[PDB]
Design an enzyme around this catalytic site. Structure first.
Site, mmCIF file in Angstrom:
data_model
loop_
_atom_site.group_PDB
_atom_site.id
_atom_site.type_symbol
_atom_site.label_atom_id
_atom_site.label_comp_id
_atom_site.label_asym_id
_atom_site.label_seq_id
_atom_site.Cartn_x
_atom_site.Cartn_y
_atom_site.Cartn_z
ATOM 1 N N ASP A 37 1.977 -9.109 -2.617
ATOM 2 C CA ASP A 37 2.002 -8.829 -1.177
ATOM 3 C C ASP A 37 3.252 -8.066 -0.734
ATOM 4 O OD1 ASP A 37 1.448 -8.793 1.609
ATOM 5 O OD2 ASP A 37 1.920 -10.909 1.882
ATOM 6 N N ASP A 222 1.160 -2.033 2.846
ATOM 7 C CA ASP A 222 0.864 -3.465 2.673
ATOM 8 C C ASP A 222 -0.278 -3.782 1.695
ATOM 9 O OD1 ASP A 222 0.616 -6.231 2.895
ATOM 10 O OD2 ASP A 222 -0.008 -6.206 4.988
#
Ligand SMILES: C[C@]1(c2cc(NC(=O)c3cnc(OCF)cn3)ccc2F)N=C(N)SC[C@H]1c1ccccc1
EC number: 3.4.23.46
Length: 374
Positions: A37, A222
């Site tokens: 992440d 992201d």
């Protein structure tokens, strides 16, 4: 430098459930699958027998566990997790051959965090200290890795879509993972991986918006988000243009809003009718930009031939999620405060069109495209 055989293919996952790497925590090593992440900064793992979980961190079994005697409460709009902070020895078996003492948030309560049916039990927050919970004093994993070892301050990601796979190259770049050249965009600020979009095109046609709208209130890279997320005003303009370019077939209004799927017979998906999407990013040099271009193969994603429209509206600014990242080899060059994009050797394309990274282009007033609190 340049070749990292042992790290190639160290990522796996299921479609829409993210990309995970194998990690070990504690002594003796406890194996866990950990979601990669780039949009958060905590290393946080299941530490209790949640029914969704294959396994969890058992602190009692580790001789190297140290309790920090501090709680952490992490709410989001999407859901929440909370846990107990500690440190332990952490390594990546299919990464660099090192062991690091890192912060671990032991998750003891959560809501809408773990996915039922997924094969991961934790999250690796790869962004900067500024967005770590509870505060920036909690050193992120990658910061600890660089500080404690000789691993260079750089990682790269090749996320391969449509059961998924890919590579996280820790400490370097693998040249076999991309075609053509890398093009770099500066990291505007070290919190999220923040970048600046200076221009948007649909089938080479400019959207003609004030470029400030493209980055309202930020644009980020992201890996922990599926969609290409665009600010509301940009989404409306982009969809209008996407609807127009594809108007040879009519789809219900709900499809464009992600309220419905659209289906075709097996193998008959009309890729040709859907436009390419280009984002121009701030280049390294004044008045110089470059362009990244994605296909419908990136923004129309299989649900299991049925697809979801994976461009959606945001109130949190632009999010360059898996829809962008599946087209490109992405280099998070922390040492030079820049992000490199190149065409991914594993990106899904057809015989007519491929994803593209192209430059240089001449773009003025790129600094003005950045948003500041009024
Ligand atoms: C911390 C958080 C987060 C993200 C994910 N992501 C995924 O599951 C996922 C799925 N598919 C992907 O691509 C295609 F395969 C990519 N990622 C899972 C758990 C999780 F905690 N990271 C963010 N950057 S934005 C929401 C936020 C969040 C925080 C609390 C609850 C839920 C989400």
């Amino acid at each position: 430098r340049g070749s990292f055989v042992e790290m190639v293919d160290n990522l796996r996952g299921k479609s829409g459930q993210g990309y995970y790497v194998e990690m070990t925590v504690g002594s003796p090593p406890q194996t866990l699958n950990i979601l990669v992440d780039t949009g958060s900064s905590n290393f946080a793992v299941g530490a209790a027998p949640h029914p969704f979980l294959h396994r969890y961190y058992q602190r009692q079994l580790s001789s190297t566990y140290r309790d920090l005697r501090k709680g952490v409460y992490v709410p989001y709009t999407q859901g929440k997790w909370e846990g107990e902070l500690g440190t332990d020895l952490v390594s990546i078996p299919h990464g660099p051959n090192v062991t690091v003492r890192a912060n671990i948030a032991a998750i003891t309560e959560s809501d809408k965090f773990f996915i039922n049916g997924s094969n991961w039990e934790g999250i690796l927050g790869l962004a900067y200290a500024e967005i770590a919970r509870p505060d920036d004093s909690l050193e992120p994993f990658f910061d600890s890795l660089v500080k404690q070892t000789h691993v260079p301050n750089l990682f790269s990601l090749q996320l391969c879509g449509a059961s998924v796979g890919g590579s996280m190259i820790i400490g370097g770049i693998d040249h076999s993972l991309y075609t053509g050249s890398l093009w770099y965009t500066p990291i505007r600020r070290e919190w999220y991986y923040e970048v600046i979009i200076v221009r948007v095109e649909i089938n080479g046609q400019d959207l003609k918006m004030d470029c400030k709208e493209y980055n309202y209130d930020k644009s980020i890279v992201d890996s922990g988000t599926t969609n290409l997320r665009l600010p509301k005003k940009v989404f409306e303009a982009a969809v209008k243009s996407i609807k127009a370019a594809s108007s040879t077939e009519k789809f219900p209004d709900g499809f464009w809003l992600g309220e419905q799927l659209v289906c075709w017979q097996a193998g008959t998906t009309p890729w040709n009718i859907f436009p390419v999407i280009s984002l121009y990013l701030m280049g390294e040099v004044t008045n110089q930009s470059f362009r990244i271009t994605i296909l419908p193969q990136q923004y129309l994603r299989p649900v299991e031939d049925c697809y979801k429209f994976a461009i959606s509206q945001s109130s949190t600014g632009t999010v360059m999620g898996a829809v962008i990242m599946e087209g490109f080899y992405v280099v998070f060059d922390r040492a030079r405060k820049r992000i490199g994009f190149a065409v991914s050797a594993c990106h899904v394309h057809d015989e007519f069109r491929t994803a593209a990274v192209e430059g240089p282009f001449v773009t003025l007033d790129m600094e003005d495209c950045g948003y500041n609190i009024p």
